[PDB]
Symmetry: C2
Subunit: 452 residues, 2 copies
């Protein structure tokens, strides 16, 4: 075989471009819950069998397949990728890898156990920018880094939404039940899909899922990060079902092993989104935009400051100097899609992993999705202390409760303001947190077990 047999799952949007990148291989089956939105894609590949439920497609065609591309809404990435991998299939899974920390940990351990090739779809990991960021840091060009600031201008779509009140009929071209997948059932509405799932906690991850995997990748790889020890967030109005218009997250990562030319001390990483930006770094010329391609990253080293854009693009040092550092990272010639295909075909003993192999991308996505935890737990009024190995917070009190705003009810009558707002009934904070870290799947939807 020179051609992989690939099944595509979630094809109408980003999946479309990913499949174009994989087109030289064999697209034998395509699954999409929405046969209207995805129609143009099924008709670029007339020969592939059409499905509208991945489980049906898997039962019929996982024999014929080597690999699965997944570009569904975030909340279903895990269950799909896990079923594919446990059947011994290679997987390309769009960023963010999974909806939850637990799901990321599971995909990481499954990739190892079944020895398949994996690729999270953060395509910047395969470009030149990151390679420079890493090589500069590792060669001592900026000294040690105790503080990084990062941001995106996303969200650029409306968030902070309330559950829409009208009921809508489910189009006959849409398999609403399979869209819901393991999440709690709720009535259909177009506000949820296509595309707009990003703002709903049960289905997407807000700006963190939209952008963070692109923005933070050079931070995570360059500073060799693992599990954070602490995290805290704040946001604009935090609703119970929808993510906020803007948020800030501060992580702390412990010291790692030093490298010959650069120490790796404890490091704070700040995240800003929704218009908020870090303060301008000292020495940067007035007027230089910190946003390049949707965001920025600032590494504050003891000898200099390294700044890059989203996707690791166009790194520079604020001193103006251009280093000439030793090359250490594999220089990737294929697209992000095709570099994975290469890996899929090398024997497992011998395999050169692609750039977003889940052995990196898993722990990385756990940082991204921890942003969501921090923000959703902000009313606990504490720095949250994370035990990474055991996937729990250690300092949420037994009797703490958490509630969220359902709807802002501000009104003015004849000049007199009223500040009403509905709140959810307080729930136990530890159980709410535990459930965000690891969801209770709706009956009929099951993850494979954690190995061992």
């Amino acid at each position: 075989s020179d051609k992989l047999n690939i099944l595509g799952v979630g094809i109408g949007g980003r999946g479309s471009s990913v499949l174009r990148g994989l087109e030289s291989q064999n697209i034998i089956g395509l699954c999409d819950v929405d046969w209207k939105y995805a129609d143009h894609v099924f008709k670029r590949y007339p020969a592939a069998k059409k499905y509208n439920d991945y489980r049906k497609m898997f039962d019929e065609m996982l024999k014929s397949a080597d690999a699965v591309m997944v570009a569904t809404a975030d909340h279903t990435h895990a269950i799909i990728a896990a079923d594919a991998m446990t059947a011994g299939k290679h997987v390309y899974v769009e960023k963010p890898l999974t909806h939850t920390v637990y799901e990321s940990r599971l995909l990481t351990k499954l990739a190892d156990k079944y020895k398949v090739a994996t690729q999270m779809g953060n395509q910047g990991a395969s470009d030149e920018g990151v390679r420079k960021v890493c090589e500069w840091i590792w060669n001592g060009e900026i000294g040690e880094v105790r503080k990084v600031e990062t941001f995106t201008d996303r969200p650029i779509w409306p968030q902070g939404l309330s559950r829409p009140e009208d009921d809508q009929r489910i189009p006959k071209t849409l398999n609403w039940d399979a869209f819901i997948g393991p999440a709690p059932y709720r009535p259909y509405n177009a506000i949820y899909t296509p595309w707009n799932f990003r703002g709903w906690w049960d289905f997407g991850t807000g700006a963190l899922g939209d952008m963070a995997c692109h923005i933070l990748h050079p931070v995570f790889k360059g500073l060799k990060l693992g599990y954070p020890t602490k995290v805290q967030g704040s946001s604009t109005l935090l609703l119970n079902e929808s993510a906020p218009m803007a948020q800030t997250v501060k992580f702390v990562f412990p010291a790692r092993d030093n490298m010959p030319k650069v120490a790796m001390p404890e490091v704070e990483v700040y995240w800003y989104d929704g218009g908020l930006k870090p303060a301008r770094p000292e020495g940067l010329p007035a007027g230089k935009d910190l946003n390049m391609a949707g965001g920025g990253v600032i590494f504050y080293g003891t000898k200099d400051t390294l700044i890059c854009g989203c996707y690791g693009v166009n790194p520079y040092l604020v001193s103006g100097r251009v280093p000439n550092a030793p090359k250490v990272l594999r220089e990737i010639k294929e697209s992000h899609q095709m570099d994975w295909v290469r890996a899929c075909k090398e024997d497992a003993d011998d395999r050169v992993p692609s750039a977003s192999d889940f052995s990196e991308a898993g722990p990385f996505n756990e940082m991204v999705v921890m942003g969501v935890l921090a923000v959703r737990l902000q009313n606990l009024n504490r720095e949250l202390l994370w035990d990474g190995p055991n996937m729990r917070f250690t300092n949420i009190p037994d009797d703490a409760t958490i509630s969220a705003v359902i709807k802002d009810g501000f009104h003015i009558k004849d000049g007199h303001p009223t500040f009403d707002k509905t709140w959810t009934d307080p729930v136990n904070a530890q159980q709410f947190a535990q459930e965000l870290i690891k969801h209770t799947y709706r009956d009929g939807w099951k993850l494979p077990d954690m190995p061992r």
Copy 2:
């Protein structure tokens, strides 16, 4: 110590409580543009003459008066206060003192020149919390302070509004033209007044004017701040007519003279609003809410960290120490209103200033309203350098521009997102900045000249 003859201007909201605080004096005339909203207040003082235009009331009654209470929308405070002061009258003017930098500088110099008693309406300046904050700092209890963080949970009303497009008839109880005052004319709508002027750049100052004078007072007086040297801000979606949902501002203030027990080095002050908070200070117990009575302040000293709420309330030290520091500030026994009345009656040669005398409140309000500048100028992508003496920024390029969003146009059609936005026509940034610092008054409305 007979009774002051007081005129009131802007009486239907806050003015109502302020008049209650002054009621043992003679309320001889009241002016309000809105005779429906303000009716209950006119009828608590049936012997005062009623007016709906301050200029009319001043031409008839400034002879008879000693003092004027101003609690109008922000954009009219300065012209009213200034006309009163130039006639030799004492003034109580609600926070924020003025809409603009220039107007604050003018009210400051008029107060000195005419030797009248003044009081900005930040009533926290007369309570005990700030005395403790100041006394602890000045006695060296927390060492030197290089960093302060501050915030409020406001706005708790909707901002980010677009100009309404419907035609609304002017109620016959409303003097819309006198509401506009020196601002640019626009069509009437109830969205602007009463109360809701706060989020419109032409009339209010957003969360900064609603809360900052309350929150930052202990910072400004405790660290003996004057003019900042630098400022920068970011926000959620910055619109052309309405303030954003949330914002951050960083000020830098230069070193002042040291006091015997505490040095006064260069200090950075941060401001956050609309849900955003500063990261939790090191040492603060888990669970302790940083918001007390609407926000909070954190002073990071070399020896300890001092935290207070809004209004300077309930100051404490993170180490748990409670100092016993020498008393230095006058212990104010009368209300914030009546402490001003006392000052009004002392001869100017002898006068003990009330706690929000414009000699402090003027420069303080300049910091507040500088936050508005920073946010409205954020597209310049630079830390702005402020020359306080000359009321100008020194590093805005002569050909730079500013454009703002008029209306977000996001929509989804058949799952495809479209991201359009209308923008204003770019204007020259120096002219735009100069105009925010010093408004061009609408024809027929003039300030007194700056004294020298």
